[PDB]
Amino acid sequence: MTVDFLSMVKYTPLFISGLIMTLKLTFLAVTIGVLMGLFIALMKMSSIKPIKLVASSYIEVIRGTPLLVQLLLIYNGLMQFGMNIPAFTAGVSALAINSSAYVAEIIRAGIQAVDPGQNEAARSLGMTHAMAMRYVIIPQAIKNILPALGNEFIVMLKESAIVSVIGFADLTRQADIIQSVTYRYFEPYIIIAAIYFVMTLTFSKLLSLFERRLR
Amino acid sequence: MTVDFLSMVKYTPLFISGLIMTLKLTFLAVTIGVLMGLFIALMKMSSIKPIKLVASSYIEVIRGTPLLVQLLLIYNGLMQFGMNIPAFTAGVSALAINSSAYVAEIIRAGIQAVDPGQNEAARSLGMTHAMAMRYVIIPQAIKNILPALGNEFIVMLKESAIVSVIGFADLTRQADIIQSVTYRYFEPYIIIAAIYFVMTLTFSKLLSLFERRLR
Amino acid sequence: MIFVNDVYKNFGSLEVLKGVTLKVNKGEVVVIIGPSGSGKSTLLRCINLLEEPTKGEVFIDGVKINNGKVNINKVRQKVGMVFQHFNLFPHLTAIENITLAPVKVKKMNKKEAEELAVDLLAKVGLLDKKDQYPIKLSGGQKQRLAIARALAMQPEVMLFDEPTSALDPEMVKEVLNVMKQLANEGMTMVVVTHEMGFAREVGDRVIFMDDGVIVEEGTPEEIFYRAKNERTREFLSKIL
Amino acid sequence: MIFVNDVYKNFGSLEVLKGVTLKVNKGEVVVIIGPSGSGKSTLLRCINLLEEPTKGEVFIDGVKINNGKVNINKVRQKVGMVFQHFNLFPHLTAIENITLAPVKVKKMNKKEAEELAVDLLAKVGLLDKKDQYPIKLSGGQKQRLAIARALAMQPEVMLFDEPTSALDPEMVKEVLNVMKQLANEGMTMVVVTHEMGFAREVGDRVIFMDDGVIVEEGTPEEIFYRAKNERTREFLSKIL
Numbered sequence: 001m002t003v004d005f006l007s008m009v010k011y012t013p014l015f016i017s018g019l020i021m022t023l024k025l026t027f028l029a030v031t032i033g034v035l036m037g038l039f040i041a042l043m044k045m046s047s048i049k050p051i052k053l054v055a056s057s058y059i060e061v062i063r064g065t066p067l068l069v070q071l072l073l074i075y076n077g078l079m080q081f082g083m084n085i086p087a088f089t090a091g092v093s094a095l096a097i098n099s100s101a102y103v104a105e106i107i108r109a110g111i112q113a114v115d116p117g118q119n120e121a122a123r124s125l126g127m128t129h130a131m132a133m134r135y136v137i138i139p140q141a142i143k144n145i146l147p148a149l150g151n152e153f154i155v156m157l158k159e160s161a162i163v164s165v166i167g168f169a170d171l172t173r174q175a176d177i178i179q180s181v182t183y184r185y186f187e188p189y190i191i192i193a194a195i196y197f198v199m200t201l202t203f204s205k206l207l208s209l210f211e212r213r214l215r
Numbered sequence: 216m217t218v219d220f221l222s223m224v225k226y227t228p229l230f231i232s233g234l235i236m237t238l239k240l241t242f243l244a245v246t247i248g249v250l251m252g253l254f255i256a257l258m259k260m261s262s263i264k265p266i267k268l269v270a271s272s273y274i275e276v277i278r279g280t281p282l283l284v285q286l287l288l289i290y291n292g293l294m295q296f297g298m299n300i301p302a303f304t305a306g307v308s309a310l311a312i313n314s315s316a317y318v319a320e321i322i323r324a325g326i327q328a329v330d331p332g333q334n335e336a337a338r339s340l341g342m343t344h345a346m347a348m349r350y351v352i353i354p355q356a357i358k359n360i361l362p363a364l365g366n367e368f369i370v371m372l373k374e375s376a377i378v379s380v381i382g383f384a385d386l387t388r389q390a391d392i393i394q395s396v397t398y399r400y401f402e403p404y405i406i407i408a409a410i411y412f413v414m415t416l417t418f419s420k421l422l423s424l425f426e427r428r429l430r
Numbered sequence: 431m432i433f434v435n436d437v438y439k440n441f442g443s444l445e446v447l448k449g450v451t452l453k454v455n456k457g458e459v460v461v462i463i464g465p466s467g468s469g470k471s472t473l474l475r476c477i478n479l480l481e482e483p484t485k486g487e488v489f490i491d492g493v494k495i496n497n498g499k500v501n502i503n504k505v506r507q508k509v510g511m512v513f514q515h516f517n518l519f520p521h522l523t524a525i526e527n528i529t530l531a532p533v534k535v536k537k538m539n540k541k542e543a544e545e546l547a548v549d550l551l552a553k554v555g556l557l558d559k560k561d562q563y564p565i566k567l568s569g570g571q572k573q574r575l576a577i578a579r580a581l582a583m584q585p586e587v588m589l590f591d592e593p594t595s596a597l598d599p600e601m602v603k604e605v606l607n608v609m610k611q612l613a614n615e616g617m618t619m620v621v622v623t624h625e626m627g628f629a630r631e632v633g634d635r636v637i638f639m640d641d642g643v644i645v646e647e648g649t650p651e652e653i654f655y656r657a658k659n660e661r662t663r664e665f666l667s668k669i670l
Numbered sequence: 671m672i673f674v675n676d677v678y679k680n681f682g683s684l685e686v687l688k689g690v691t692l693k694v695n696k697g698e699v700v701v702i703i704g705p706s707g708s709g710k711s712t713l714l715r716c717i718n719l720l721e722e723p724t725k726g727e728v729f730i731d732g733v734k735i736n737n738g739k740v741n742i743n744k745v746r747q748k749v750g751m752v753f754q755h756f757n758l759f760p761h762l763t764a765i766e767n768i769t770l771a772p773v774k775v776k777k778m779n780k781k782e783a784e785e786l787a788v789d790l791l792a793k794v795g796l797l798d799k800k801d802q803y804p805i806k807l808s809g810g811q812k813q814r815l816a817i818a819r820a821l822a823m824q825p826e827v828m829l830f831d832e833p834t835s836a837l838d839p840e841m842v843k844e845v846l847n848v849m850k851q852l853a854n855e856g857m858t859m860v861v862v863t864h865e866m867g868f869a870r871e872v873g874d875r876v877i878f879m880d881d882g883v884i885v886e887e888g889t890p891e892e893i894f895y896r897a898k899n900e901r902t903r904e905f906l907s908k909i910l
């Protein structure tokens with residue numbers, strides 16, 4: 001045919017529905033990823049070499065390897081074990097596990113980023129590593145980490161579209177549905193990309209108007 | 216069943232074949248992405264106000280929106296126009312177009328990264344903007360951009376796995392090919408992730424031995 | 431020759447110059463001093479338009495250069511600038527640093543430019559370093575190199591923006607000596623500095639600035655020994 | 671009290687200390703001077719183990735502290751350190767900056783700690799700033815605040831690592847004045863500085879270091895008028 005966006009108006013509740021799942025997926029994965037990411041960071045800080053080794057290897061592998069292959073490894077790879085996990089839980093697991101590795105590194109880099117003089121002064125005042133960390137360094141790293149976390153979210157918004165291929169009804173999946181009743185792929189994809197763009201801009205501006213409510 | 220990797224040895228030529236396709240896909244996509252990216256950066260620098268708008272809008276959209284949706288928009292969205300482009304040309308176009316925008320930002324940022332004193336000194340000696348750029352600033356922006364280009368490649372290697380969903384015979388697709396004759400998903404996915412990982416490490420340490428041969 | 435005429439400079443709400451006037455003629459050595467936030471460096475940088483006045487004008491050689499109606503590169507060809515954090519081109523060797531602008535700007539020929547450069551390296555005591563890259567130079571060597579580079583364009587006035595204040599103490603004298611040699615040869619100079627010994631030994635005028643305005647000027651001896659203004663005396667008491 | 675004994679320090683291939691011995695007794699004001707690359711700051715930072723000797727030993731109050739057989743926090747409680755770049759805690763206010771360690775390390779109580787803090791703030795002239803945050807202080811106020819903070823831990827010695835070399839010239843005197851007050855009150859001090867006036871005025875000894883070694887020491891008048899060694903003379907000719 002030729003382009004016809006006005007046909008697409010009928011499918012607004014689908015577009016809207018897909019969007020809400022894209023939010024819900026991301027928000028839950030990144031939330032779990034943060035908590036997981038936290039705990040994995042701590043393990044790498046451990047003085048006990050085998051635990052630091054495991055956290056390091058986890059992080060290195062999850063980051064050094066594609067999100068897709070992680071998704072599929074959970075979803076398809078587990079079938080032959082009599083394990084049939086739903087699309088939503090598979091995507092949440094994959095995304096939270098991917099995000100956890102990137103988050104652990106965000107934390108480590110936020111701590112390395114506070115000026116080493118702070119620690120020096122703190123310890124020079126009779127403080128132990130523990131106290132210095134509690135009262136001087138960590139609060140400061142926090143301000144380094146929070147805006148990078150908010151950015152991790154925004155990136156994960158785009159990243160979550162990958163669970164479409166698993167048959168999860170996210171925003172991107174709505175184009176396979178619409179075409180089935182319209183035979184049109186083009187217009188709903190343009191529309192979907194536009195929803196992604198608007199989400200990206202909105203959350204970015206919300207993010208920058210938060211780095212200025214810190215500085 | 217239970218795990219059996221040793222069965223997988225027979226399928227070594229598949230894994231290898233896929234690996235070479237992911238390389239060919241990436242290397243070619245990023246190469247075009249660089250050329251395109253340069254041109255779009257240059258375009259954004261232009262004094263002609265509508266053109267800076269065009270380059271800016273392009274970059275902003277390609278980056279603020281998922282790679283997947285761009286792929287599907289090319290492969291599926293163009294079908295209803297009587298255009299059936301192959302999986303490979305679709306994947307290369309999608310990846311090079313994504314890469315073009317990210318490279319366009321890398322370049323601009325490598326130019327912004329050279330100390331403004333260089334330019335000030337340059338102009339203070341009577342040099343025009345053109346001469347300062349030509350003989351002082353750009354040679355220095357280059358050393359900022361190359362290690363970021365090298366890293367763009369490494370990232371796209373992981374990204375290219377997304378053309379699996381389109382049926383391109385890359386590294387990741389080989390797990391769908393192997394399982395159809397084995398009924399096993401897990402082991403070929405593990406193997407694939409191991410291959411992606413080794414690629415990441417190899418190119419990364421190879422990248423570090425070049426971030427040390429420039430500065 | 432140099433006429434900065436009642437200029438103001440703002441960076442947003444930050445008022446840095448609040449009505450400043452400076453005239454300097456051929457052969458003067460003018461020295462501008464003051465505390466941080468006096469505005470002395472922003473004034474100095476208006477003279478070759480690395481900074482643009484919010485209001486007021488700057489004339490060099492009698493023609494207005496902040497009206498958009500002038501080739502500013504040819505203006506900067508005449509007005510040299512030496513920077514606090516030396517602004518050497520890292521990818522270029524010493525002599526390359528010196529010859530880049532004469533060759534590219536004046537279309538001087540390679541051999542002639544190289545002779546100019548070796549003469550200048552010899553003058554500032556860097557002859558043995560001609561084929562060295564900036565990385566391998568000390569601070570003093572860097573600033574002396576940068577001064578050679580500015581000299582190779584043979585300006586009519588030379589501007590110095592705190593040329594030694596990023597130098598180690600044992601590194602200061604050798605740079606000030608090159609500056610003094612320039613003063614003794616008649617070079618026109620505007621120097622923003624902390625080193626009051628220089629201003630005494632070789633300055634013709636000392637300008638004291640505070641909160642974006644000139645509050646007192648006079649000869650080095652008038653300012654350092656007989657300052658009439660309260661604020662001048664106060665500043666000098668903390669600094670001398 | 672302090673005994674640095676033949677220590678060496680490496681940072682990879684870079685040899686910074688090459689066999690250095692330092693003895694300081696209660697109530698001395700020792701000033702260590704030299705060019706960049708002399709090693710004077712690394713020597714300074716060996717005393718409270720912010721830097722670890724590669725070889726040799728350091729004793730404080732007669733016990734060795736670079737062997738792992740000691741509680742180091744208890745050591746640093748005795749040995750204050752004042753930093754070039756101030757190292758104020760940004761998120762804590764002036765008074766909070768001061769009271770943090772006494773409360774948390776000495777288990778002093780909020781009221782006693784605050785009374786201590788306001789006394790010290792009065793002493794260094796910062797009472798009007800007690801509830802201000804560092805970002806709002808000048809360089810001089812910053813360094814005076816950091817000195818207040820170190821004093822709040824009542825150390826037996828104070829180490830100063832170029833405390834005025836990052837301050838604007840109009841800011842140096844006030845920090846040096848607080849330091850001289852400490853010297854006049856009997857505080858044991860090891861000071862690495864560029865400001866030779868402080869040493870002339872208040873110093874008991876001057877140590878001249880060069881290429882990772884102490885090449886000469888004596889009283890300030892001995893070093894400044896009658897230096898025996900050629901290197902001491904070269905350096906002083908560039909720096910005085």
Ligand SMILES: NC(=[NH2+])NCCC[C@H](N)C(=O)O
Pocket residue numbers: 063065066067068098099100102152155156159373374
């Ligand atoms: N949590 C994240 N930010 N993950 C980024 C994933 C990057 C890329 N899409 C990959 O598959 O590796």
Ligand SMILES: NC(=[NH2+])NCCC[C@H](N)C(=O)O
Pocket residue numbers: 158159278280281282283313314315317367370371374
């Ligand atoms: N050229 C790149 N590095 N692209 C990164 C893409 C990030 C993410 N996978 C997305 O689809 O938005």
